[PDB]
Design a protein around this ligand. Structure first.
Ligand SMILES: CCCCCCCCCCCCCCCCCC(=O)OC[C@H](CO[C@@H]1O[C@H](CO[C@H]2O[C@H](CO)[C@H](O)[C@H](O)[C@H]2O)[C@H](O)[C@H](O)[C@H]1O)OC(=O)CCCCCCCCCCCCCCCCC
Ligand code: CLA
Ligand code: CLA
Ligand code: CLA
Ligand SMILES: CCCCCCCCCCCCCCCCCC(=O)OC[C@H](CO[C@@H]1O[C@H](CO)[C@H](O)[C@H](O)[C@H]1O)OC(=O)CCCCCCCCCCCCCCCCC
Ligand SMILES: CCCCCCCCCCCCCCCC(=O)OC[C@H](CO[C@@H]1O[C@H](CS(=O)(=O)O)[C@@H](O)[C@H](O)[C@H]1O)OC(=O)CCCCCCCCCCCCCCC
Ligand SMILES: CCCCCCCCCCCCCCCC(=O)OC[C@H](COP(=O)(O)OC[C@@H](O)CO)OC(=O)CCCCCCCCCCCCCCC
Ligand SMILES: CCCCCCCCCCCCCCCC(=O)OC[C@H](COP(=O)(O)OC[C@@H](O)CO)OC(=O)CCCCCCCCCCCCCCC
Ligand SMILES: CC1=C(/C=C/C(C)=C/C=C/C(C)=C/C=C/C=C(C)/C=C/C=C(C)/C=C/C2=C(C)CCCC2(C)C)C(C)(C)CCC1
Ligand SMILES: CC1=C(/C=C/C(C)=C/C=C/C(C)=C/C=C/C=C(C)/C=C/C=C(C)/C=C/C2=C(C)CCCC2(C)C)C(C)(C)CCC1
Ligand SMILES: CC1=C(/C=C/C(C)=C\C=C/C(C)=C/C=C/C=C(C)/C=C/C=C(C)\C=C\C2=C(C)CCCC2(C)C)C(C)(C)CCC1
Ligand SMILES: CCCCCCCCCCCCO[C@@H]1O[C@H](CO)[C@@H](O[C@H]2O[C@H](CO)[C@@H](O)[C@H](O)[C@H]2O)[C@H](O)[C@H]1O
Ligand SMILES: [Ca+2]
Lengths: 341, 39, 31, 39, 34, 38, 30, 35, 503, 78, 63, 31, 39, 30
């Protein structure tokens, strides 16, 4: 028994927390990402990068803490602790936003490790690896939003900050500057996510309301046995119900569950494609035909042109505070605004 | 050289449900992207 | 409205090409 | 208590839940006092 | 920094408490696994 | 040899010494103490 | 004239719905 | 009966719980900082 | 039968028809290259390489021919602005026709390999069915790639036998194709040093030749052969897709950030040049040196080349376009005709004012004019009832130096405001908007389009890698799990997950 | 279905677990407390105290602008 | 299994199907070269990233 | 040249519609 | 009412030669009429 | 751009010729 196989045995033991070879990458990297985020949201400020308090130590709450993105002056520097910026000074590394790349990079490798874990466990137990394939969706989202978008932009500063209100800021920023709602790829993402939720709800309810009478209790949960060979609910009755209610119904269980995988995953992937576009400011910002007609015809108004106006207002009012490194100075009189407001 | 029948050839199938699903997908993609194609 | 001059042809082909792909495959099925 | 040598698991649960409620109450109280309270 | 001493001393107290209340059985287990 | 070069090489050395091969040593040691019985 | 294209795609989608309902493959138990 | 005390599970438990409790003590203390 | 998404798996175990489909794909790609070049040639405007270069015309493949030394047409012109050059056969037209003929020949070879699929070369002589020795094929192809890489570096790029490559000055004003010597020091790893590219190809080609020789001679370890399913061609597909998306990310990044292989004369400027005012800084330094001689403002600014000023215009940033704003940048602002010269804004009191330029992020941006020490002295107010800093009240006037408006001063507040809005975009240019019926909204450059396409394709190829790696490693359960599979998965029964020999 | 380790309910219902932890858990709680309450956290992480966001000479946001020399920049911000 | 002249010439190249070296073979050598490649990739990334600044050049269009 | 603006779409459809009719019929033959 | 299979249904065929002839006819009609469609 | 349409139809015709020759239905005696 060579040392490699002895290690393989130890790593793949049946214990409370399976480790596996993938655990070597997953657990330290996941721990770094999670502990870095908790440490930043508890203790670390964004005063020097954003001019914002972003930790419990400064009086922020769960909704307003964040591991904020680094200062825009660093471009896409990876901001290693030992790098030319912090130069091994941990306190400075915290103050310049080193925690953001720390968390982002360890999270990316922890995500890799987790998908490798999915593969490893699927191989060990003897099933098909469709869980890893499904997890590719969240991976695409994380790569596109947290890595690809800022890499296309001027710096990590424009990456989403790891915090609740930081994420909301990123969301509103994308609306105002990129008109992300108008983007057909975001639209397909929305459809995928809403359809996934719909499928989850409808499938759970359908199963729960076509159950077979397999027990005597009003509590129907105890009339199932994991080793039972037969279906626990009536696919035939479910199909008839949905055919008569909605017009169509699933008749193939395998297709149903594959569809439940396919919908949200496809949605995540399409929205990731859209975010890649936004990284290069390749927006679906405008419909030129309506823009031209409005520029010539002062009576032409659509909801599209109204949304354009909202975006203009948001940009002008938010940019000075959202981009403090720019030293934007917008005198009050240049701010766009409607009457009386 | 001789021309021998290839024994690797297999039929392809698209059932009616798959037809309806694909046709709906294509129609809704067209609905989605036509406005942007026109701009 | 002054729309992109390729809009109609792009939309028609975007729909028609996969439509005919599906139609061919469906119709020949069972051969 | 009702059995010697061990704590009932429900006693442990009640105590731990009271502690969790207490830490949450302290955080909610702190939302209104000291830093972050708008005053 | 005296602040470091006062922040670390509770950790050491907890560690030594756990050691003095678990060490016999922990050493038993360490020896058994060789 | 610049400061950034020196720190890069130090990063290599300290990543190995701190992470790669105390972890390899520990993994090998424990795998060889607790051995599966066939 | 782009209105014609929008109406066409919308009609195609609705027609697909009608056929998928009326002319569906019957679910059969066997 | 007579299970091992220290395990990989013990370490996974503590790796999380111990810094969690320390952080909670810190945040509790934060609650009484005055400006 | 096969579901639609599996049709191509019919060549999975048919090396002859796999070669056939690869040949057909290669023919299609080569034919696309030829036809794309022909189309671009049929519409390229060669007259004005200064204000209408290729990257303003949506030219996508033309820069790639020019990068490696094909810069002249049969029709007399060259993308370096010259005329009357004789490229020989290897002009844009010659290269495109070469790709078309290659496409045809590859098509014919594909047909032959489809029809005559059952060659004895493909069948294992030991047993009697089709078999490919994938490690040996890798050794062969790797040795070949190393040879070709070394030859490209040593003969083409150096000019030992070949044209060399496009190199340019840091400001994209004198780009041309020349031989490049390799740089063997650390500077070879500067992405903006072309000698680095030459040295890379020489050294990596030698490394590839040596690695191919090793892989032509040493068989895989049995451990590796089983773990990586080296008898499964899908393992090659998985690892190849991985390598390919790695390369695609790299090329998108080097296109977006700029480097020696993505010169601005061929692909346009980068967004980071606008961000940092790279060209603005250079122009200002040239003007200040002229002034340090004793030249007047007009003379100093008239020394500035129109091409350099054209780089300093936000409409040429690749980060200003839109996903559905299609076509050439000339379809946006129009075809640039001439520089209007540098405006200098002075308010009523003699203060000279700087108009704050539009950043890349902003689709719209307020007009703000600040003095030397960063205090707003004028603006264009949205609301006027409490306006205090308007161009009307501040008495802002503008005088132009160099360019079309050289020596002209404007005091009419409408004129001043329009020129302030122009200065927001950087250096000002007259445009012809009638040729393209240009719509007024900015397009992105080929740099932007290339980066977008390749970043998206790399992202999708990640999923392809995951899918095919999983199909390789889980081939045994692709049609479903074993109808047994009861106790192996049960918790705690076995000391090692899956291993039946353990408890 | 047990992978070998002692069940949690067993452990946390035992006397010895509680003799250990009625000490260890409060010790960590108060160590985190003291970490904050002694001011150590401010100095360790560089987080401003409520009186150090602005100084009698810097009334504006101390936004970093320098690409490599941030130690000097931070010290000049104070 | 049609024979061709070119097929006969190429035949020894496609004859060693499935033959392997028992055990781990050159896997250690492969691993060391993988580690060197990873270090090289980190170096050129950090240079391109401006996190590794060497003497003699600048990562800039001026070089 | 200023050609009829419907020329391309008319030509494409004039060819494509019967092309796909023939293709469908041919491919399904033998079913 | 019941849905009875219609016994009048017959297969349709287009042989390969007919395919080539029709495709050539369509291509040459397109060649002929495209110039007039463009005018 | 109408030139593209003319070239397309001409190429379609020529491609049809090539397939009708190379890939014809063999005449068979039976
Ligand atoms: C599959 C997924 C599986 C999961 C994987 C998760 C693990 C990922 C590990 C990889 C981490 C990648 C970090 C990339 C850092 C980077 O790129 O950092 C950026 C640097 C370049 O630095 C940037 O360069 C810019 C341009 O500068 C140039 O131009 C300027 C103006 O002219 C100046 O002249 C300057 O001197 C000159 O260098 C600016 O200076 C920026 O401020 C500066 O940050 O590139 C570089 O290091 C290297 C460039 C080549 C390689 C790029 C690969 C990544 C590319 C992604 C796509 C990019 C864009 C498309 C977006 C969509
Ligand atoms: C001798 C044949 C030949 C020649 C001289 C050319 C020449 C040219 N082609 Mg072309 N082409 C050919 C065959 C050829 N082609 C074939 C067979 C196809 C079909 C696949 C094409 C498809 C094609 C397209 C789509 C395009 C060209 C283009 C071009 C022009 C620019 C090429 C370029 O940028 O290279 C870029 C090549 C690389 C950057 C090589 C990447 C390979 C990676 C880096 C190595 C892979 C890893 C390695 C194998 C593993 C490590 C080994 C290592 C250790 C040694 C140029 C004039 C471009 C053009 O200008 O259009 C008109 C263009 O867009 N060609
Ligand atoms: C990556 C490869 C690539 C890149 C970077 C470019 C880049 C460029 N090309 Mg192009 N081209 C290419 C490939 C490429 N081309 C190919 C393969 C062809 C043959 C068709 C062409 C033929 C071509 C022509 C005829 C022209 C160009 C032109 C141009 C320029 C204008 C770009 C533009 O507006 O596009 C617009 C891009 C979009 C509108 C994005 C479309 C996104 C689609 C709709 C997404 C599809 C969604 C999908 C269905 C979702 C699936 C759903 C899910 C469930 C799976 C630009 C520099 C123009 C030019 O200026 O020439 C001088 C021009 O006239 N090219
Ligand atoms: C070198 C790249 C490469 C190659 C050779 C393959 C090859 C294969 N793939 Mg795969 N794949 C790839 C990349 C690749 N893939 C990438 C990047 C992804 C992520 C998007 C996938 C995701 C994927 C899945 C989910 C599946 C495969 C499957 C297959 C097998 C059957 C393919 C088939 O018949 O579909 C036929 C396709 C059609 C009939 C129509 C496809 C139309 C597409 C959507 C649009 C075409 C646009 C245009 C023509 C292509 C230009 C894109 C180009 C620039 C890359 C085959 C061996 C299947 C398989 O495993 O079979 C068992 C399978 O289920 N692949
Ligand atoms: C049968 C086979 C043919 C099949 C066709 C399938 C058709 C689909 C419908 C067309 C879709 C594209 C329409 C674009 C709208 C348009 O009018 O473009 C119009 C443009 C041309 O644009 C024109 O250009 C002119 C100058 O040449 C002028 O500037 C005009 O103003 C301008 O309109 O056509 C193209 O851009 C073709 C190239 C598109 C590819 C570039 C991007 C490559 C990367 C893409 C990444 C995609 C990822 C998706 C992933 C998910
Ligand atoms: C933070 C987490 C970190 C994760 C760490 C993971 C733990 C280590 C995992 C190692 C995985 C790779 C080992 C694969 C096993 C192997 O190849 O053969 C096992 C061999 C064969 O030995 C002997 O060989 C005998 C014969 S045979 O040749 O193997 O058949 C055989 O009988 C016998 O079994 C065997 O003892 O054993 C070894 O002694 C060779 C070690 C080579 C391992 C690769 C080293 C490269 C990494 C170093 C990186 C730095 C390099 C310098 C960079 C500047
Ligand atoms: C009240 C009754 C009247 C109903 C009217 C409402 C119409 C709803 C009918 C469903 C349409 C059929 C589409 C799937 C085509 C079809 O016939 O599918 C039939 C299919 C049956 O699946 P089976 O299990 O039988 O298929 C298994 C194998 O055949 C695999 O192919 O159902 C599904 O796949 C469910 C998932 C898609 C659900 C699609 C819902 C889409 C909603 C409408 C979106 C378009 C709106 C655009 C407006 C412009
Ligand atoms: C390995 C990569 C795979 C490609 C093989 C490249 C090797 C070609 C060596 C030729 C360069 C050597 C060289 O510099 O030649 C010099 C000669 C003319 O060069 P010039 O006089 O213009 O340039 C100055 C030269 O004298 C100095 O090289 O070019 C040739 O005639 C090529 C000679 C053989 C032609 C190719 C041989 C047959 C092809 C097979
Ligand atoms: C940073 C860093 C690092 C790392 C660290 C770590 C890794 C750590 C950590 C950490 C951690 C890991 C921490 C923690 C925590 C926690 C917390 C803070 C918690 C909490 C909580 C809560 C509050 C809860 C609540 C609740 C709810 C809400 C529900 C029900 C009830 C209860 C109570 C449960 C190192 C040194 C490496 C280096 C440098 C950088
Ligand atoms: C036969 C032959 C010949 C001829 C050849 C030729 C004449 C050719 C060609 C060719 C060509 C002329 C080609 C081509 C191509 C194209 C392609 C291949 C394309 C494409 C496409 C795509 C793929 C696209 C896609 C897309 C879309 C659609 C949208 C946007 C996005 C994307 C890009 C995705 C010769 C006599 C010489 C020789 C003998 C044989
Ligand atoms: C859920 C849950 C849990 C927890 C629980 C807890 C944590 C708690 C509780 C609770 C509590 C903690 C309670 C209480 C109570 C009390 C009461 C109910 C009372 C009373 C009374 C009264 C009625 C009063 C009266 C009065 C008046 C009226 C005035 C005069 C004086 C006096 C005070 C007498 C457990 C783990 C177990 C299980 C699972 C989950
Ligand atoms: C799985 C991979 C994990 C990767 C991460 C692992 C952790 C990496 C930590 C590496 C940290 C490098 O930290 C770096 O160490 C060196 C060497 O001591 C310090 O260097 C210090 O000491 C050395 C020598 O004693 C002096 O030459 C130097 O002037 C001084 O700064 C750097 O100031 C610090 O930046
Ligand atoms: Ca007033």
């Amino acid at each position: 028994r060579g040392w490699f196989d002895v290690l393989d045995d130890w790593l793949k033991r049946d214990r409370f927390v399976f480790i596996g070879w993938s655990g070597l990458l997953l657990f330290p990297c996941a721990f770094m990402a999670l502990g870095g985020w908790l440490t930043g949201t508890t203790f670390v400020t964004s005063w020097y990068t954003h001019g914002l308090a972003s930790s419990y130590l400064e009086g922020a709450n769960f909704l307003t803490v964040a591991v904020s993105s680094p200062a825009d002056a660093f471009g896409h520097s990876l901001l290693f602790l030992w790098g030319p910026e912090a130069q091994g000074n941990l306190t400075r590394w915290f103050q310049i936003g080193g925690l953001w790349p720390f968390v982002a990079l360890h999270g990316a490798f922890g995500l890799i490790g987790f998908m490798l874990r999915q593969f490893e466990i699927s191989r060990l137990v003897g099933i098909r690896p469709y869980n890893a394939i499904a997890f590719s969706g969240p991976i695409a989202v994380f790569v596109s939003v947290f890595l690809m978008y800022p890499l296309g932009q001027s710096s990590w500063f424009f990456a989403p900050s790891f915090g609740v209100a930081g994420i909301f800021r990123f969301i509103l920023f994308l609306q105002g500057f990129h008109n992300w709602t108008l983007n057909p790829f975001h639209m397909m993402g929305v459809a995928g996510i809403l359809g996934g939720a719909l499928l989850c709800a409808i499938h759970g309810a359908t199963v729960e309301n076509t159950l077979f009478e397999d027990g005597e209790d009003s509590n129907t949960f105890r009339a199932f046995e994991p080793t039972q060979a037969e279906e626990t609910y009536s696919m035939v009755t479910a199909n008839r119900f949905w055919s008569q209610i909605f017009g169509i119904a699933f008749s193939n269980k395998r297709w149903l569950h594959f569809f439940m995988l396919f919908v949200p995953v496809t949605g995540l992937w399409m929205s990731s494609v859209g975010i890649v576009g936004l990284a290069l400011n390749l927006r679906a910002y405008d419909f030129v035909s309506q823009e031209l007609r409005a520029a010539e015809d002062p009576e032409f108004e659509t909801f599209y042109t109204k949304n354009i106006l909202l975006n203009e207002g948001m940009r002008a009012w938010m940019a000075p505070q959202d981009q403090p490194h720019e030293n934007f100075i917008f005198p009050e009189e240049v701010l766009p605004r409607g009457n009386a407001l | 050289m001789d021309r021998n029948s290839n024994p690797n050839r297999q039929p392809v199938e698209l059932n009616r449900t798959s037809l309806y699903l694909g046709l709906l997908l294509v129609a809704v993609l067209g609905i989605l992207f036509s406005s942007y194609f026109f701009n | 409205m002054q729309v992109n001059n390729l809009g109609f042809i792009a939309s028609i082909l975007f729909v028609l090409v996969p439509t005919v792909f599906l139609l061919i495959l469906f119709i020949q099925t069972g051969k | 208590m009702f059995a010697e040598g061990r704590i009932p698991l429900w006693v442990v649960g009640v105590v731990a839940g009271i502690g969790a409620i207490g830490v949450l109450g302290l955080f909610f109280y702190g939302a209104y006092a000291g830093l972050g309270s708008s005053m | 920094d005296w602040r470091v001493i006062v922040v670390v001393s509770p950790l050491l107290i907890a560690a030594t408490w756990a050691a003095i209340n678990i060490g016999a059985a922990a050493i038993r287990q360490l020896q058994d696994v060789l | 040899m610049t400061p950034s070069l020196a720190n890069f090489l130090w990063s290599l050395v300290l990543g190995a010494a701190i992470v790669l091969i105390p972890a390899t040593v520990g993994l090998i040691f424990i795998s060889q103490k607790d051995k599966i019985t066939r | 004239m782009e209105s014609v294209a929008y109406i066409l795609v919308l009609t195609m989608a609705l027609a697909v719905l009608f056929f998928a309902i009326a002319f569906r493959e019957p679910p059969r138990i066997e | 009966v007579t299970y091992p005390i220290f395990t990989v599970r013990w370490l996974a438990v503590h790796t999380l719980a111990v810094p969690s409790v320390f952080f909670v003590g810190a945040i509790a203390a934060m609650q009484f900082i005055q400006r | 039968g096969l579901p639609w998404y599996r049709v191509h798996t019919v060549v999975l175990n048919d090396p002859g028809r796999l070669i056939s489909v690869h040949l057909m794909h290669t023919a299609l790609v080569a034919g696309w290259a030829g036809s794309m070049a022909l189309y671009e040639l049929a519409i390229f405007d060669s007259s004005d390489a200064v204000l209408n270069p290729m990257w303003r015309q949506g030219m996508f493949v033309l820069p790639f021919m020019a990068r490696l030394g094909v810069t002249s047409s049969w029709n007399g012109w060259s993308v370096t602005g010259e005329t009357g050059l004789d490229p020989g056969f290897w002009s844009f037209e010659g290269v495109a026709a070469a790709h078309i003929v290659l496409s045809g020949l590859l098509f014919l070879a594909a047909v032959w390999h489809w029809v005559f699929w059952d060659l004895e070369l493909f069948v294992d002589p030991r047993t009697g069915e089709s078999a490919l020795d994938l490690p040996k094929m890798f050794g062969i192809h790797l040795f070949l790639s190393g040879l070709l890489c070394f030859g490209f570096g040593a003969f083409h790029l150096t000019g030992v036998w070949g044209p060399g490559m496009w190199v340019s000055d840091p400001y994209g004003l004198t780009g041309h194709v020349q031989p490049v010597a390799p740089e063997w020091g650390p500077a070879g790893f500067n992405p903006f040093n072309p000698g680095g590219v030459v040295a890379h190809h020489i050294a990596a080609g030698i490394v590839g030749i040596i690695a191919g020789l090793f892989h032509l001679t040493v068989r895989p370890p049995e451990r590796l052969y089983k773990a990586l399913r080296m008898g499964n061609i899908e393992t090659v597909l998985s690892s190849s897709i991985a390598a390919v998306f790695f390369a695609a990310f790299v090329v998108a990044g080097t296109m977006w950030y700029g480097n020696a292989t993505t010169p601005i004369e061929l692909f346009g400027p980068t967004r980071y040049q606008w961000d940092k005012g790279y060209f603005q800084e250079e122009i200002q330094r040239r003007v200040d040196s002229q002034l340090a001689e004793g030249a007047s403002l007009s003379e100093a600014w008239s020394t500035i080349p129109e091409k350099l000023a054209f780089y300093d215009y936000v409409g040429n940033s690749p980060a200003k376009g839109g996903l559905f704003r299609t076509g050439a940048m000339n379809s946006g602002d129009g075809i640039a005709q001439e520089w209007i010269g540098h405006p200098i804004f002075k308010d009523k009191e003699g203060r000279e004012l700087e108009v704050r330029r539009m950043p890349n992020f902003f689709e719209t941006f307020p007009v703000i004019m600040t003095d030397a020490d960063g205090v707003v002295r004028a603006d264009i107010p949205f609301r006027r009832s409490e306006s205090k800093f308007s161009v009307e009240q501040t008495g802002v006037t503008v005088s132009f130096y160099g360019g079309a408006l050289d020596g002209q001063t404007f005091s009419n507040p409408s004129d001043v405001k329009k020129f302030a809005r122009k200065a927001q975009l950087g250096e000002g240019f007259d445009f012809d908007t009638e040729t393209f019926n240009s719509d007024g909204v900015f397009r992105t450059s080929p740099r932007g389009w290339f980066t977008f396409g390749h970043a998206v394709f790399a992202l999708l190829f990640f999923f392809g890698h995951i899918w095919h790696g999983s199909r390789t490693l889980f081939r045994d359960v692709f049609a479903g799990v074993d109808p047994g599979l009861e106790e192996q998965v049960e918790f705690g029964v076995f000391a090692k997950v899956g291993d039946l020999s353990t408890r | 279905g047990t992978t070998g380790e002692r069940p949690f309910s067993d452990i946390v219902t035992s006397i010895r677990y509680w003799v250990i932890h009625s000490i260890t858990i409060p010790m960590l709680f108060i160590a985190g407390w003291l970490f904050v309450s002694t001011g150590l956290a401010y100095d360790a992480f560089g987080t401003p105290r409520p009186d150090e966001y602005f100084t009698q000479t810097r009334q504006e946001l101390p936004i970093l602008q320098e690409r490599y020399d941030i130690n000097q920049e931070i010290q000049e911000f104070n | 299994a049609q024979r061709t002249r070119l097929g006969d010439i190429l035949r020894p190249l496609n004859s060693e199907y499935g033959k392997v070296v028992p055990g781990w073979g050159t896997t250690p050598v492969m691993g060391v070269f993988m580690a060197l490649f990873l270090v090289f990739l980190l170096i050129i990334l950090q240079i391109y990233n401006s996190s590794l600044i060497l003497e003699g050049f600048s990562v800039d269009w001026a070089g």
